[PDB]
Design a protein around this ligand. Structure first.
Ligand code: UD1
Ligand code: MN
Length: 349
């Protein structure tokens, strides 16, 4: 067994066939890959739709007692059932290219990848990461490539890599359940590879609610962030490398996560809740890492670590308004003091 395609379902009857047709049309022998379907207690006709593909595909189907509250637990149940050499997570509302398992198998046989990224394509207006999919690369690291800018589970992982290092998704969590999982796989992979010859994984936009839009409390969200920083800092790598990996994670988190602009969008009466959870995550980042981060984020790291929402919000409002209490211009960049009696933050551009 080469691959295990792990499919978590939850009331997926309107789009599960578009998936199952792409596996049935794979030009890969159905005897060397399995479809591990774990249903998160669906109440529509998802399972009988799946049943019609029991002679078109090698299937392993099971259903949970109650809905787990997220994609994590179903994938965890499928992953310990998987006996394929490699694992591919495909969501119920997505589908893969006809040639995916053939090109992957051929690529991994040639380069012995532990994690293999496959190029993605957005369908029906859904955005998709692309900065790391412009060239097929046999070997990429966390620091010479943009792989940290895609933490979704929609990749090829070697089964032994996940099991030998005890890598699973957090359970009862609507979103952010993928970031810690994929980063742990990145942290332990002896070789990470990118495969961009075609458009392999098709991420769709349908209706209704996608899990990436479901509510996750700031406590649960930033606990995952805190766990990622802890995983980075205690990886079996050189200490300077771990600091730089953490800095690159923070650059991306503060630029593109819900943290970016929270004190401008969240209701005032809820922002202490955010600054306390965000601060528990930044308090796990040692202050030495602030120097490796993008300069504009250093005042935010500083006031997050101190749980100071007033100065944090003033920094965000100042960036948005382009107005500062005091600033100097040195070497085409700004050195800013955001409030009276506060420190100056230098090199901001
Ligand atoms: C970035 C990307 O390309 N895909 C991610 C995106 O998918 P997305 O935002 O589309 O969320 P989805 O609804 O597709 O959920 C992902 C998968 O989990 C299953 N599911 C959903 C709810 C539930 O209670 N039990 C269950 O098993 C879905 O059927 C689906 O197969 O946001 C999710 C939340 O982090 C991630 O898991 C997906 O990997
Ligand atoms: Mn989806």
């Amino acid at each position: 067994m080469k691959f295990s395609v792990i499919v978590p379902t939850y009331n997926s009857e309107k789009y599960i066939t578009e998936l199952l047709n792409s596996l049935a049309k794979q030009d890969f022998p159905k005897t060397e890959f399995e479809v591990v379907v774990v249903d998160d207690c669906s109440t529509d006709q998802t399972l009988q739709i799946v049943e019609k593909y029991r002679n078109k595909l090698n299937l392993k189907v099971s259903q949970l007692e109650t809905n787990s509250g997220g994609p994590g637990k179903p994938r965890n149940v499928a992953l310990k059932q998987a006996e394929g050499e490699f694992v591919l997570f495909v969501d119920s509302d997505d589908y893969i290219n006809k040639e995916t398992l053939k090109d992957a198998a051929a690529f991994i046989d040639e380069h012995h990848s532990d994690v293999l990224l496959i190029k993605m394509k957005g369908v029906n207006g859904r955005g998709v990461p692309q900065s790391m999919f412009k060239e097929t690369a046999p070997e990429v690291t966390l620091l010479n490539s943009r792989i940290i800018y895609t933490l979704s589970p929609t990749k090829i992982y070697r089964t032994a890599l996940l099991k030998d290092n005890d890598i699973y998704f957090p359970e009862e969590l609507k979103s952010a359940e993928d970031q810690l999982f994929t980063m742990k796989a990145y942290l332990n992979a002896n070789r990470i590879s990118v495969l961009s010859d075609k458009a392999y994984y098709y991420a769709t936009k349908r209706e209704g609610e996608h899990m990436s839009s479901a509510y996750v409390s700031p406590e649960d969200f930033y606990e995952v962030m805190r766990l990622i920083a802890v995983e980075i800092l205690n990886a079996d790598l050189e200490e300077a490398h771990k600091d730089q990996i953490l800095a690159e994670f923070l650059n991306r988190h503060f630029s593109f996560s819900r943290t970016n602009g929270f004190s401008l969008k969240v209701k005032l009466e809820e922002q202490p809740q955010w600054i306390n959870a965000l601060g528990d995550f930044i308090q796990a980042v040692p202050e030495r890492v602030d120097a490796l981060v993008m300069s504009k984020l250093r005042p935010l790291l500083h006031y997050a670590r101190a749980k100071d929402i007033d100065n944090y919000r003033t920094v965000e409002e100042s960036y948005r308004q382009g107005q500062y209490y005091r600033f100097d211009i040195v070497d085409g960049k700004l050195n800013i003091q955001f409030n009276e009696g506060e420190p100056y933050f230098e090199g901001i551009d």
